[PDB]
Design a protein around this ligand. Sequence first.
Ligand SMILES: C[S@@+](CC[C@H](N)C(=O)[O-])C[C@H]1O[C@@H](n2cnc3c(N)ncnc32)[C@H](O)[C@@H]1O
Ligand SMILES: C[S@@+](CC[C@H](N)C(=O)[O-])C[C@H]1O[C@@H](n2cnc3c(N)ncnc32)[C@H](O)[C@@H]1O
Ligand SMILES: C[S@@+](CC[C@H](N)C(=O)[O-])C[C@H]1O[C@@H](n2cnc3c(N)ncnc32)[C@H](O)[C@@H]1O
Ligand SMILES: C[S@@+](CC[C@H](N)C(=O)[O-])C[C@H]1O[C@@H](n2cnc3c(N)ncnc32)[C@H](O)[C@@H]1O
Ligand SMILES: [K+]
Ligand SMILES: [K+]
Ligand SMILES: [K+]
Ligand SMILES: [K+]
Ligand SMILES: [K+]
Ligand SMILES: [K+]
Ligand SMILES: [K+]
Ligand SMILES: [K+]
Ligand SMILES: [Mg+2]
Ligand SMILES: [Mg+2]
Ligand SMILES: [Mg+2]
Ligand SMILES: [Mg+2]
Ligand SMILES: [Mg+2]
Ligand SMILES: [Mg+2]
Ligand SMILES: [Mg+2]
Ligand SMILES: [Mg+2]
Lengths: 381, 381, 381, 381
Amino acid sequence: EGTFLFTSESVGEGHPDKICDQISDAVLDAHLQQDPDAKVACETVAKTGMILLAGEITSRAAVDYQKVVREAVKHIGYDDSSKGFDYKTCNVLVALEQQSPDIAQGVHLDRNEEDIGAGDQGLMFGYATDETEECMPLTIVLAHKLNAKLAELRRNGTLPWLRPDSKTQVTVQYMQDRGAVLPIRVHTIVISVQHDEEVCLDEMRDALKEKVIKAVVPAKYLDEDTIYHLQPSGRFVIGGPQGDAGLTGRKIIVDTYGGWGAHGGGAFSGKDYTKVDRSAAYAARWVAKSLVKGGLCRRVLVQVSYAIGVSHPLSISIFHYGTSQKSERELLEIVKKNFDLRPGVIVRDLDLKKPIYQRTAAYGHFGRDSFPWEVPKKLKY
Amino acid sequence: EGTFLFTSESVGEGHPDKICDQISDAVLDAHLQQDPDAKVACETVAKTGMILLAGEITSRAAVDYQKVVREAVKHIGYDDSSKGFDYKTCNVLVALEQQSPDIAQGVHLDRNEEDIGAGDQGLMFGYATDETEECMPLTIVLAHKLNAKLAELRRNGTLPWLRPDSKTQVTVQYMQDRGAVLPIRVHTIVISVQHDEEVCLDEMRDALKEKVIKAVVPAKYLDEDTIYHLQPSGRFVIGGPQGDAGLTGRKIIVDTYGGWGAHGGGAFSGKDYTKVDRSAAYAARWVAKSLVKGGLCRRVLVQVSYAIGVSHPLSISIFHYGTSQKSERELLEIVKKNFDLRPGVIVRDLDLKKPIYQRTAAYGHFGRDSFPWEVPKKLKY
Amino acid sequence: EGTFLFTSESVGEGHPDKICDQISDAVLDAHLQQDPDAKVACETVAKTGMILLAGEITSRAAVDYQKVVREAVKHIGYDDSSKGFDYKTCNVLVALEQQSPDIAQGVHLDRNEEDIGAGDQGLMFGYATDETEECMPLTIVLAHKLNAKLAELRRNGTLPWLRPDSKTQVTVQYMQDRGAVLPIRVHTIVISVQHDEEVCLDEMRDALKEKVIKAVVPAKYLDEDTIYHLQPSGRFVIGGPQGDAGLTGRKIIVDTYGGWGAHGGGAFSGKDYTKVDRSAAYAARWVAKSLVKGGLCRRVLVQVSYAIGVSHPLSISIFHYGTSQKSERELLEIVKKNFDLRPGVIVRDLDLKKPIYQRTAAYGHFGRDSFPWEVPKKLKY
Amino acid sequence: EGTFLFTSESVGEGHPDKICDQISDAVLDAHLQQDPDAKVACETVAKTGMILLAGEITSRAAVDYQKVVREAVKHIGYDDSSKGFDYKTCNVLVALEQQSPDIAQGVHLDRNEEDIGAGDQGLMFGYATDETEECMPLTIVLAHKLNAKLAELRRNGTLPWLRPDSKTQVTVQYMQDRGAVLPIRVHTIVISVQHDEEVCLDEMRDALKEKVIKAVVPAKYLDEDTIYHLQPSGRFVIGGPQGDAGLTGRKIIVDTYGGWGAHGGGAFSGKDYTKVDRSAAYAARWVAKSLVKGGLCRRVLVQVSYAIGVSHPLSISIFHYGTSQKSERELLEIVKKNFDLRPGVIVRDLDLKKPIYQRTAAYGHFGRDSFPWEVPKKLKY
Ligand SMILES: C[S@@+](CC[C@H](N)C(=O)[O-])C[C@H]1O[C@@H](n2cnc3c(N)ncnc32)[C@H](O)[C@@H]1O
Ligand SMILES: C[S@@+](CC[C@H](N)C(=O)[O-])C[C@H]1O[C@@H](n2cnc3c(N)ncnc32)[C@H](O)[C@@H]1O
Ligand SMILES: C[S@@+](CC[C@H](N)C(=O)[O-])C[C@H]1O[C@@H](n2cnc3c(N)ncnc32)[C@H](O)[C@@H]1O
Ligand SMILES: C[S@@+](CC[C@H](N)C(=O)[O-])C[C@H]1O[C@@H](n2cnc3c(N)ncnc32)[C@H](O)[C@@H]1O
Ligand SMILES: [K+]
Ligand SMILES: [K+]
Ligand SMILES: [K+]
Ligand SMILES: [K+]
Ligand SMILES: [K+]
Ligand SMILES: [K+]
Ligand SMILES: [K+]
Ligand SMILES: [K+]
Ligand SMILES: [Mg+2]
Ligand SMILES: [Mg+2]
Ligand SMILES: [Mg+2]
Ligand SMILES: [Mg+2]
Ligand SMILES: [Mg+2]
Ligand SMILES: [Mg+2]
Ligand SMILES: [Mg+2]
Ligand SMILES: [Mg+2]
């Protein structure tokens, strides 16, 4: 009684959509290394043998797109035609133009940096939950860690049949507690991972349980009733872009909260700080996690929204799930007194000209590595 | 006291991402017209002068991609280089391969149709709210209608300076009422729309208020405090793919609930019914709207999830926001007794081999035109 | 005294331009297998990881371009990323539209087949020389045979370090004899061939002399003065499209007479019989070889030309180098009495709807395998 | 008696192949403006809505390919979707990598500039004929001038129905005179030119005769027997890349001697001086024209050939058609005493690092504007 299921997924570094996110952010970082004020909107598309870059960049940097793309693919692990994709020999196509001058004049031309307009309209959410120390849902934390474990065991050679393309999915049974949520047990785990031709299904399923799941998921969460769907398709030799086209910004729930919270629809990768889809979502995460680590909430959702060309957010909303003694109105007032959500101030607070974006583009943007948006702000009230 | 803001956005038919969604679904419909069992996973990318199709199709149809793409762009209204894009003269590139045989064998090969596996893993949500007759959030309903009004006034020649690329955003002030939400007033409206070189800002802003906003939004919602951001960038001559690259599946919140509810991350357009991202999200909407129209809830969120190759959902969850006398456990039991969420049963219930998908690919997939997922199921309990 | 040098080159099946010619003709043959009246103008471009098809096809055939392209690349031998290109994993992009209706109406619409117009304007030459039995210049015959020998030794595994991309060049010293030419000796041979990383230059140069040159070139032509440039660049590991972009119709002298004779500029591959660039050049070869095998000339050049939409050639010219007792005017009259050079008659005489074109697209179109244009017509005069 | 026909063609600036040549050379010039030692091998492909650049460039220049391509297309005149192509709105795709290091090390790395190796193997020809002052065949001179006249009348607005895509073809009746050739009369003229929808065939044919042919071709060459094929297809509204795919290096006979002389197969455009296809063909033209203007020959063909990595030509041959009192052996000795045909010396003599290449890429590379290869060298003997 009072229990429910919730499911989240994650994907690996070689999932084709995630390849695109990583490449887009490799391009962004390459520009930022030379020009901290680069305007970047780089979409990547991946299909058999092809990486296409399409979008808009205005920058003083000189970037060798061939080299940057190929290095990103190399890092992921696609280095031979036997794996379905090879950084050495794939096609790299570039369709990158300047930023529209109409956008530039309306957003940033001649504006004081603190008073730059949002680079687009849109809405964004931040979320935090005290169910884990890092203030993330357990479902997606576990899903990410399963993909990370696959990559680890691939790279260290202990499961050399593994390839870079993987997906995981975790269903947890929760109890609720005055609006907060309490994990009880893992109900179902899915793992699918690309593999070499020679390994059999039974060898894979045994390894996935023993060397992946048991290594990652605490035994206290696994019991006789847990359902395992390990290599449920039965065969996954074809993978990466050869198996499924990839695009930037097609894993936005994997990138964020795994179905928990909410999403405003904007993708992160390939975008500089003036694109509030990224900067304001990072800031909203920072606000949410500041409220939870500050002891004001156990769980909270923050919405913000913007108009192109306008600095200040159009709206800010706080939803605390009943997990605060303060009203949502009071929390909103605390937020407004402690945060300035103009993009030209977020950039300073969160150090958003620094070329660290490729590191964000797999395993989620939140809940790890003490990025600036993960370090709570101390609140005055 | 008790009030909050919420913001949602929509985009027009000529927004570059939406162009891609429409093209992807034009391709799907073209295949389904000849082969109801076509397996389609068609991604579209749009940039200056270019439509690229990339993905996987296994079908008995013979489809003229050149023709289908160009006709979709023609419908949208991009028919001259003065508008930034022309169906007659753009490049159409095709990188479409067969569906992976490894996927096919794991999903649908040799399986009874009712027992086809999900075409992928993933999670999906359905949502319904009694705040409007069509059981959609007012914020996004209004946002969509503003874009539809722009297209209407473009097509009828009364505002001939309009071009197809538009975005809108609506912030509503709400009151809550026992978990349900009650719209009070429109707080802020944003409209940005591509325009010809000759029309001035003041002419546009006057028209957008008088002929667009007032035509769509009830006066009772607009007052002296409402904020209007009309052509806030000041100039939007460059637009469509020339101004911003488009991709399929980059408007998934516009396609669904505008930030309300939740999203599992999967895109709809370009996918046949075996891709549960679409079919199970449609079914989840159908469940949610059935619960609200059936009088069981005022507002409800439904989660479902799947594993590739497995027919039955892995999990089902119901969240009623406190708006039912029945427990969430009781509602879940009603759902399980009344719905079969296998993809090979959803296809029959929702008629998902019918080539009506292009019609879904602008102005949201939900809350309009009495598609099968909008017709409540009568529940037995 | 009276001697001169002449040089011709050839390239192998994996030279990037020749890859394109072969793919274009694989596409043509695929169409002709289903629709003998297909209108085909298929250009191919090759670069790292990419085959692009661009051009115009109007056909009743259903052709799987992915499959046809990949099979052609497989035949050539590019089957692994270690070789720089892999048919399994490369990108195939398609930008093929219908034939222009304006062309169609002016060329073939509603016209009796014998009276179809030329598909374009242009000029074409045929050439024949009695210096070899097959009526080809010795320089290019030898150059082709050197590339064929490389491919043979690659395919049979005796030189497993060889890759498909090769070039050869042969300089012969000739004497003249009343307008005819008499080979004396080979002055210089060049061979460059892509190779694996592990083989050293000395091993390659020894093999190229002993196993390639000596196997192909009669010893009577090689002496102490012959110059050998074997792997003259010193290193050729990177090759195929990765080393150099390829295009259809960039080897038109290799395809024909090696610098001897003349050329009107039109490419052969990827074109159906209505494109007189191919059909009329084949017919001109047939005329030239008929004059030499008929005993009228020892050496002869034939020019023809056409206007788009017009059936009969605009001009015909015969140049016999002084090697006939008959005047050029008399030979022209014999040609006109014995040949009908309308494209809709050439197609019947030379069987040009038959899908044998891929076989023409390496090692020259002339002087081998008794194609119809190589079988002399018996002349009446 | 003693007369014969000869035909040559030319194409206009907007013919799709010529568009590609011009773009390739615009790219070369852009690089040379910043880096005189740029290594450039830029192929261009054009089809509906698309310019693709593919090839190899190693340069210190920073070139904005978008801008350079679009400016070249603008110059040609494709500036509106009504014309079938628009520089403002077409797709520009870039697939340009570095020059292969294996090539670089074998050709130019660490070599004294005069002693740089040829950038490839190949053969090249130069030709000159005293039949015109500029030492070019009359057939192609006239063909070029007809296309130039079309462009002139398009640009000055007197025939505003003209579009940039055109082709011409001229057949001249000649007499021979001791190996030299003497034009007598124009036998046939073809002109095809893209046109707007509204102009009728009779208006076009009248204009083409009166305003184009009569303006260009001396009346003494036109008589009652001359055949005119003016707009012979009847309709040519669709044109440019939309009507026919273009590629660099598909007009190599138009670029040179119109079927006269010979050709070694290599294309000119998009290549720096180390590519002997261009530099040695220019030098061979210079030699030929020096022999004719020096009074040694009336007509002459020069062959040269190279091996990759080797500076000096492998072979040189002179054919004087019987038009000199000196033997061909004597002429060869004069050539060898007066010319150094190493590429690293040709570059100095012919100023081949200067960014003048786009000017060569329509209307032929020879016989006009007193380029260095058109200024005879004064010979010592
Ligand atoms: C199954 S595919 C999406 C549907 C696909 N585009 C189609 O044509 O049916 C989505 C992801 O699943 C994974 N995948 C690919 N092949 C698979 C297989 N044989 N078994 C399981 N998962 C697979 C990869 O991570 C891929 O990016
Ligand atoms: C502003 S753009 C996204 C950022 C962009 N890629 C860049 O390079 O900065 C997103 C959408 O805004 C709209 N847009 C384009 N140009 C605009 C302008 N000048 N003013 C307002 N909105 C514009 C179009 O709907 C476009 O698809
Ligand atoms: C040398 S490349 C043409 C020039 C080249 N595009 C560049 O960037 O310098 C022409 C042909 O030579 C051959 N080739 C490629 N790399 C070579 C090498 N390292 N040594 C010799 N020949 C090579 C291949 O057959 C190739 O298609
Ligand atoms: C006729 S096309 C080549 C054949 C063509 N690729 C096909 O699909 O049949 C070659 C050139 O002829 C010219 N051309 C195009 N359309 C034409 C027409 N309707 N009439 C005459 N010439 C035309 C253009 O200069 C074009 O580049
Ligand atoms: K968000
Ligand atoms: K996909
Ligand atoms: K969803
Ligand atoms: K974008
Ligand atoms: K020819
Ligand atoms: K090349
Ligand atoms: K030449
Ligand atoms: K063509
Ligand atoms: Mg995806
Ligand atoms: Mg957005
Ligand atoms: Mg977008
Ligand atoms: Mg998904
Ligand atoms: Mg080439
Ligand atoms: Mg031609
Ligand atoms: Mg051509
Ligand atoms: Mg060559």
